[PDB]
Amino acid sequence: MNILLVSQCEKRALSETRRILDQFAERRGERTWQTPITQAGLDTLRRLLKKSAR
């Protein structure tokens, strides 16, 4: 597992998306993150993002 995450969110949503992702990966751009992570970890990240999606 070696992940790159990119965000295209808007307005209020992008504040939330930042709140989620920033806990799992260093921010390497205004809307991008990139780190290694375990497969189970990634699955949990996906679940958390889906839990509250505008």
Added chain:
DNA sequence: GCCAGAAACCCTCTTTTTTCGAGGTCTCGTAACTTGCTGATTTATAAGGGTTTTTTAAATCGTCCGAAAAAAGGGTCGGAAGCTT
């Protein structure tokens, strides 16, 4: 001859520094005021009832805006159905 460093040249951004402009504000100079002379001619006016133009409100219309409602979409949970064992 090789290698390194420093220096000269090119371009753009960032920040002060200077400059400029608008405009605001005050004060004094002065061309055109005001006050004073006469007498022939022109103009205004005391009241109030009937009569034109503009103001003013109301209504209407149109537009715009905002809010609410409805639609749309992202997703979760539980249940039922289908398939496989």
